[PDB]
């Protein structure tokens, strides 16, 4: 198979509006934020503007192909694929995607989608000018799929740090921590899984 | 062949969502920025806003036709073509495309796409009012393709397209290519680094 055949086969068989569950088992989605910049901290209104790469991975076995005499991966536009309906529960602006809207699909059906995103959050920005700094918490999970349809997990790799973060920002990253949760609301009798990402940062100097 | 036939043939055979590789060779993409303006240097949050023409060329020999008693080129909307997924790795705003989203296709299969783009970057702007000025570095590469699928090469300095009405002036523009291989993975990752050295006018 060439890339044209691979893509053709993806178009046949991929349903962008149908969650790829296999036996009523949830679709396991992993999410990791790589922070690139912190752009406007508003001390007065507790608002922050962040740029981050949102590394999101999951499996969709409908996409799989036989990788003998064939490419092991392809880039496919996200409008041809199902993508998890992740949202930052505490965002106060629409996520602005800065990068080409393509995902990388592997022959086994593993999908990686990593948009660079600019987005505004309401978070506690008192302490940003101190040594311990401030913490912005970003809570990400599925907007419409509860825990039997989508599970969300952090990645195993807090083995990095600020290599990704712009040397030119007024701010520096002290630490990033990831906690997984599942919360139940008064609206909805089942639980929604989220990752809470904590961005500990401070003004330089 | 008339332009209708040319475009028809492009629609048959061009797949906007399939990289036009050809015998597992990468698609060789060349990229050059021509700076038109520098709009807001923000001393408070180290940011600059630039306008530039992003001259991008590559080949897709599937598109080629016989140019005897025929047009040698056509303008085709980019939604009919595969375009490389280039990004400024260090951009902090979505690229705003100012110009019609059309590319030129030549009879040999060469494609030229040159949007005028406005975009924001993080850069150290403290020395912009000095004689040596400041430098904005823009790192461009494929967002999802490694070097065996898409290769990227630069094609320096000129002020030819720069607005004489900008508060700023261009001292220099340099373009280097970077190619890295990591121990995990046998493929190389390529980017073009563009350095824009500029200062406030006297």
């Amino acid at each position: 198979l060439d890339r044209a055949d691979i893509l053709y086969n993806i178009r046949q068989t991929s349903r962008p509006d149908v969650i790829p569950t296999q036996r009523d088992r949830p679709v396991a989605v992993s999410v990791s934020l790589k922070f690139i910049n912190i752009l406007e901290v508003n001390e007065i209104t507790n608002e922050v503007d962040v740029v981050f790469w949102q590394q999101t991975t999951w499996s969709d076995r409908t996409l799989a192909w036989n990788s003998s005499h064939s490419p092991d991966q392809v880039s496919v536009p996200i409008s041809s694929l199902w993508v998890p309906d992740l949202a930052a529960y505490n965002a106060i602006s629409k996520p602005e995607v800065l990068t080409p809207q393509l995902a990388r699909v592997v022959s086994d059906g593993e999908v990686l989608y990593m948009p660079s995103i600019r987005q505004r959050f309401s978070c506690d920005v008192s302490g940003v000018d101190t040594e311990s700094g401030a913490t912005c918490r970003i809570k990400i999970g599925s907007w419409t799929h509860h825990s039997r349809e989508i599970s969300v997990d952090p990645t195993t790799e807090n083995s990095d740090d600020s290599e990704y973060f712009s040397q030119y920002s007024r701010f520096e990253i002290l630490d990033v921590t990831q906690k997984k949760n599942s919360v139940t609301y008064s609206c909805c009798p089942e639980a929604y899984e989220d990752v809470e990402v904590s961005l500990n940062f401070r003004k330089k100097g | 062949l008339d332009r209708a036939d040319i475009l028809y043939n492009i629609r048959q055979t061009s797949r906007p969502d399939v990289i036009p590789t050809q015998r597992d060779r990468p698609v060789a993409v060349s990229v050059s920025l021509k700076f038109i303006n520098i709009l807001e240097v923000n001393e408070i949050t180290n940011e600059v806003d630039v306008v530039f023409w992003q001259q991008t060329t590559w080949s897709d020999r599937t598109l080629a036709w016989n140019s005897s008693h025929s047009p040698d080129q056509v303008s085709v909307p980019i939604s009919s073509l595969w375009v490389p997924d280039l990004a400024a790795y260090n951009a902090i705003s979505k690229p705003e495309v100012l110009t019609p989203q059309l590319a030129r296709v030549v009879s040999d299969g060469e494609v030229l796409y040159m949007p005028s783009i406005r975009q924001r970057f993080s850069c150290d702007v403290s020395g912009v009012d000095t004689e040596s000025g400041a430098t904005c570095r823009i790192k461009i590469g494929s967002w999802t393709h490694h070097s065996r699928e898409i290769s990227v090469d630069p094609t320096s300095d000129d002020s030819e397209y720069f607005s004489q009405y900008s508060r700023f002036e261009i001292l220099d523009v340099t373009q280097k290519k970077n190619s890295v291989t990591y121990s995990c993975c046998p493929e190389a990752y390529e980017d073009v680094e563009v350095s824009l050295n500029f200062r406030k006018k006297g």
């Binding site: 990791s32 790469w53 590394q55 991975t57 991966q73 880039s75 990068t99 990388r104 593993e110 990686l112 990593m114 660079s116 990645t155 790799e157 083995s159 990095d160 290599e163 990704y164 | 990004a87 790795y89 590469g141 494929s142 967002w143 999802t144 393709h145 490694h146 890295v180 990591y182 995990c184 993975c185 493929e187 990752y189 980017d191």
Partner: peptide
Amino acid sequence: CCARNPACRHNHPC
């Protein structure tokens, strides 16, 4: 890989 370059992160997840 895991790290650093966007395209490398795509092709070798982490």
